[PDB]
């Protein structure tokens, strides 16, 4: 008649009663409704007799944080109301009111009964008993134990059953004595050693944050698995020497691992049937619930059954260390990993497979309704065996999920079970349906561009407008016909020294008009070029020429020193083909060369010039260094249009950049975001420029506020965001910025430009569901040919996908948004 300590789960039920904790404030509550032919006065008397036989039903929970069996209670009478005279619709109105009320109502602490029983007579021989209880009172095993004795007395009121000799208060005494040593200590050591690397719970594709939910609202996805399928699954488990529990957990794990893009995942597993304690304990009423966590690892190539066996061994060992509660573990874990009072383990698996009796309550009358709510749960996967029927029910908070995702996940679970029934193993989960079409059209970018070669584009434009000025630096400049004559002499010179197709020429990045002449000559003769910045530490300049195996370095002071003027300036015999390397650029110092062919380079240029209608009236400001791939667009992109290129002597002088645009009438800006941002801080409020029509911001992050400064100082310019790789032909992903278009923390990365594709892949290289974060890969015609003189890097970065063809892993992380674009989250 004394108070006793709570089990750790009961302690947790008490803690979870606190509204201050995430998704808490609800001590777990359970609702039941059953249909019988049996009279209430007799069931009511049987109910008090079970209280007399099973005094734990006479328990009260105290505000103290302890439990006590009451000396006694006011005798309980099941209230019975007759709905017999009511039409079925009104009978339902009363049944619905009691069900709704019992589901939302919570038992107060200090309330003597921890249960409530109300019943209706719908017909003289049709009854519906509606009831509820607080979880601190009892288990499900206990609920049917009670139902069995209750119905016994209905039929045989005088067939008096013995009292429990071993009572809950004796049960709890032993509990308090056990938690001192032996198995407690042994289990604690087992768990203590595992705890430091116990995995996190999987992260699901939630629609909403728990803070947006407050009180959870549960719905369900249910199905009954027929006896034949159930027996086939059991036989499979028998052949594989495993329990169906491991079989079910593994299938559940596949669904979760797929959707969350996880390799390892912690699963909240509920432990049933306590510790032995005494000879009569399975015969008494009380709460025998305990927590265990399941450490699952799905990062396997291995067969389904292998994963099941791994799961089985894990389950079996964990249950031998049940003597240390998972509640204690999680307390230690969340303090260990600084998780704070958060809903850390919201995904739970519960099983009554071979863990249920005849269902004494259904022997009394059929189950019509059941509902339960627990704190801090997003989804409870519960499987029950019912006289051979396999009952599967996923109880989930509707507020946290997109209903279509939720239906899809359940559907996949069931389909995996069906495959195990027919084949014995499963097909890896994959997604298509109302998702596949979005990606299918997203990547539908093919266009009829001939590519050809970079110098051919120059040659033809030079013939169309030979007296146009092509390159401007100071008061010195070159025309299109001059570039052809000068580059023809230089190319003959290079050819005459034995430099041919397949060779490489290093060139220096100097601000001289002759730099362009030398650059064109190298390509016209068929050699690829390698740019070097003259201000690189000297040892790096030497490193690159040696590492790249170049034959000669071309300085700018050559025309007058190598007697170039002695050479013919007439037409050259063509050498290069579209498939040849145009250039090799060294990046990411240690640095690797990136091999780019003429076709790839051309297609990017052709698409940009066509999309933005670039023409002979345009002016491009050459701010960017020649050591970048970015400069290819400026040089070749200008020449193919008949446009004018302006060189900048010193890119750091923002005032010079402003002076240049104003004095030269620049129409196209092409920089990394940092330059436009810096240039704009040397601009006063009175400043306005109407010469820029197009601004290309390429690479790096673009601040959401940046367009505001661009738009006010350059009110007529179109601001474009461009992403890509150097391991690809400069640009791959496009997005215009039409002001800040939404309340968001990011600018859409965008969509592919032309003849390019993009994918988001999971940890196993399969497509991620829309909204799921994974690795970013690029495919299509814009790819580089590999790294120069680094085979291991090429091997891992450039791969051949069985469905998508050659793709490049950029290694950036991100996801597709259902809106039709890629959002990226940086590299990590």
């Amino acid at each position: 008649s004394e108070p006793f300590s709570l089990t750790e789960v009961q302690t947790a039920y008490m803690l979870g009663r606190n509204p201050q904790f995430e998704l808490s404030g609800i001590s777990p509550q359970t609702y039941f409704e059953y249909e019988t032919e049996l009279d209430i006065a007799r069931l009511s008397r049987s109910f008090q007799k079970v209280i007399q036989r099973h005094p734990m039903l006479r328990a009260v929970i105290l505000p103290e944080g302890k439990q006590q069996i009451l000396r006694d209670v006011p005798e309980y009478e099941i209230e019975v109301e007759s709905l017999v005279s009511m039409p079925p619709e009104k009978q339902a109105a009363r049944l619905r009111e009691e069900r709704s009320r019992m589901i939302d109502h919570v038992f107060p602490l200090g309330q003597w009964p921890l249960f409530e029983l109300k019943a209706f007579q719908l017909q003289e021989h049709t009854y519906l008993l509606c009831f509820r209880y607080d979880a601190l009172l009892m288990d499900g095993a206990s609920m049917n134990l009670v139902g069995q004795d209750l119905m016994h007395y209905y039929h045989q009121p005088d067939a008096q059953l013995p009292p429990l000799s071993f009572t809950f208060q004796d049960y709890m005494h032993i509990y308090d004595d056990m938690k001192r040593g032996t198995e407690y200590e042994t289990a604690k050591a087992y768990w203590t050693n595992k705890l430091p690397d116990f995995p996190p719970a999987p992260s699901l594709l939630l629609a909403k944050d728990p803070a947006e939910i407050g009180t959870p609202n549960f719905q369900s996805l249910t199905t009954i698995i027929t006896k034949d399928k159930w027996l086939k699954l059991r036989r499979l488990a028998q052949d594989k020497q495993v329990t169906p529990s491991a079989l079910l957990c593994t299938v559940y794990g596949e669904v979760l691992a797929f959707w969350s893009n996880q390799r390892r995942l912690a699963i909240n597993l509920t432990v049933f049937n306590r510790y032995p304690v005494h000879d009569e304990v399975e015969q008494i009423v009380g709460d025998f619930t305990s927590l265990i966590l399941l450490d699952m690892d799905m990062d396997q190539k291995q067969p389904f059954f292998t994963k099941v066996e791994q799961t089985q061994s894990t389950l079996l060992d964990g249950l031998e260390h049940r003597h240390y509660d998972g509640v204690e573990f999680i307390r230690d874990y969340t303090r260990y990993h600084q998780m704070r009072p958060k809903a850390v383990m919201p995904i739970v698996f519960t099983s009554m497979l071979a863990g249920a009796g005849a269902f004494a309550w259904e022997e009394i009358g059929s189950l019509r309704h059941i509902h339960a709510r627990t704190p801090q749960v997003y989804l409870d996967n519960v499987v029950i065996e019912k006289n051979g029927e396999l009952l599967v029910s996923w109880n989930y908070v509707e507020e946290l999920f997109d209903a279509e995702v939720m239906e899809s996940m359940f559907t996949q679970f069931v389909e995996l079970l069906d495959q195990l029934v027919e084949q014995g193993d499963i097909n890896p989960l994959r997604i298509s349906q109302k998702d596949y079409a979005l990606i299918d059209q997203y990547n539908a970018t093919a266009e009829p561009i001939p590519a050809a070669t970079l110098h051919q584009l120059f040659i033809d434009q030079a013939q169309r407008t030979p007296d146009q000025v092509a390159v401007v630096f100071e008061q010195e400049w070159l025309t299109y016909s001059e570039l052809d004559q000068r580059s023809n002499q230089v190319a003959r010179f290079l050819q005459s020294r034995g430099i041919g197709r397949g060779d490489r020429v290093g060139v220096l990045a100097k601000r001289q008009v002759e730099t362009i002449i030398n650059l064109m000559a190298v390509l016209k003769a068929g050699a690829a070029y390698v740019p070097i910045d003259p201000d690189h530490p000297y040892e790096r300049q030497t490193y690159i020429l040696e590492n790249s195996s170049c034959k000669i370095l071309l300085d700018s002071d050559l025309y007058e020193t190598m007697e170039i003027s002695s050479y013919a300036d007439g037409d050259l015999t063509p050498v290069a083909e579209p498939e040849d390397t145009a250039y090799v650029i060294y990046t990411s110092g240690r640095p690797k060369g990136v091999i780019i062919t003429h076709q790839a380079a051309s297609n990017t240029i052709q698409d940009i010039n066509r999309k933005f209608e670039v023409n002979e009236e345009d002016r491009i400001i050459g701010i960017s260094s020649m050591c970048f791939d970015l400069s290819v667009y400026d040089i070749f992109g200008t020449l193919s249009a008949g446009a004018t290129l302006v060189m900048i002597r010193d890119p750091r002088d923002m005032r010079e950049l402003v002076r240049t645009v104003e004095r030269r009438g620049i129409t196209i800006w092409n920089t990394v975001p940092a330059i436009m941002d810096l240039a704009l801080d040397h601009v006063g409020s009175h400043f306005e420029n109407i010469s820029l029509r197009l601004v290309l911001l390429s690479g790096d992050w673009i601040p959401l506020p940046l367009p505001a400064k661009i738009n006010r100082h350059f009110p007529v310019a179109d601001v474009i965001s461009l992403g890509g790789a150097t391991e690809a032909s400069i640009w791959s992903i496009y997005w215009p910025i039409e002001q800040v278009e939404a309340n968001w923390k990011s600018i859409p990365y965008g969509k592919p430009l032309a003849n390019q594709t993009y994918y988001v892949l999971n940890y196993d290289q399969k497509m991620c569901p829309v909204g799921v974060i994974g690795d970013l890969y690029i495919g299509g015609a814009g790819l580089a040919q590999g790294y120069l003189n680094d085979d291991q890097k090429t091997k891992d970065a450039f791969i051949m996908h069985p469905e998508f063809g050659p793709i490049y892993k950029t290694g950036d992380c991100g996801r597709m948004r259902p809106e039709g674009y890629i959002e990226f989250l940086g590299r990590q």
Partner: protein, 323 residues
């Protein structure tokens, strides 16, 4: 081929305790130590290596710094001076009976202007002949007005632009005739036309030379740009709103060989004959025009690649009238 520099005729100098004063600046060092001999040599036209040979005899750096400063300060010059330098010395001869405030205070200036508009010649006798106002002037003259506001949306049509320019073309009537009188019949002033992007139909932005014999425009420069900072603030609205502009360039080589200094003078007059003729035609064509008192001509002369004998004497801004 070395550039010859002359003591600029616009500069005078004095000895002082501080140093030597040339124009508005005071100098010390070798330049002081040089005495009139420097002055006399600079006076006849000497190249730098010769001045160093004669006037160095000290550190080369010192000698070079002095000559560089004098060139920068326009003490030593290359050739013929522009009008702003030519008339500069007359400032020391004019004595202003008015306070300086007429150049700072709007009210002081308005007083000045109103008083001057009602002035007469002092040496007059007490008798006069009153003229009648009974006749008439044609609209082409009496209704002309300077415009400072333009239609920035409508481009000047090609035919309009051609017809306005035709006002200065050559005609052949057994000799070359113009639509206006000039010089001794030499017509020593070149016309350059500047067009802003898309403001004139059929013409690309840039600086063009007009050839009156052909009735055509030939591009000289389509790279550089004219900017608002090439104008004084009072005229920046005009700059921003105009469509095109016309520059009048005097060729010393076309006149000086026959008239000497007078040729420069006559060209200064001729510019106003041309200007009036052009404005009359512009009014028939609804083209607004406005004269500019001062502009950054040095930058423009650079853009047009004008030679040593060439100077811009006058410039006019314009476009279709705002309406």
């Amino acid at each position: 081929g070395e550039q010859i520099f002359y003591w600029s005729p616009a500069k005078h100098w004095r000895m002082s305790d501080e140093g030597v004063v040339i124009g508005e600046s005071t100098y010390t060092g070798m330049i002081l130590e040089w005495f009139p001999e420097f002055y006399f040599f600079a006076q006849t036209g000497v190249t730098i290596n010769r001045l160093l040979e004669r006037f160095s005899s000290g550190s080369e750096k010192e000698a070079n710094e002095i000559l560089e400063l004098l060139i920068q300060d326009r003490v030593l010059v290359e050739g013929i001076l522009p009008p702003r330098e030519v008339f500069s010395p007359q400032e020391g001869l004019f004595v202003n009976p008015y306070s300086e405030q007429i150049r700072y205070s709007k009210e002081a200036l308005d007083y000045y202007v109103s008083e001057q508009l009602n002035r007469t010649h002092a040496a007059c006798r007490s008798t006069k002949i009153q003229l009648e106002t009974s006749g008439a002037l044609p609209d082409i003259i009496q209704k002309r007005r300077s415009c400072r506001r333009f239609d920035m949306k409508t481009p000047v049509s090609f035919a309009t632009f051609s017809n306005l320019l035709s006002s200065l073309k050559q005609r052949k009537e057994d000799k070359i005739l113009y639509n206006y009188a000039s010089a001794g019949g030499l017509y020593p002033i070149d016309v350059f036309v500047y067009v802003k992007p898309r403001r004139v139909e059929g013409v690309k932005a840039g600086f063009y030379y007009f050839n009156p014999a052909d009735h055509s425009l030939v591009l000289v420069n389509n790279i550089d740009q004219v900017i608002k900072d090439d104008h004084e603030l009072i005229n920046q609205d005009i700059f921003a709103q105009s469509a095109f502009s016309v520059y009048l360039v005097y060729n010393a080589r076309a006149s000086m060989p026959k008239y000497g200094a007078a040729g420069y003078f006559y060209a200064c007059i001729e510019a106003g004959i041309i200007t009036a003729t052009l404005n009359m035609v512009a009014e028939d064509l609804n083209v607004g025009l406005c004269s500019i008192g001062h502009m950054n001509f040095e930058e423009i002369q650079t853009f047009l690649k004008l030679e040593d004998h060439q100077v811009i004497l006058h410039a006019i801004e314009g476009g279709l009238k705002i309406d």
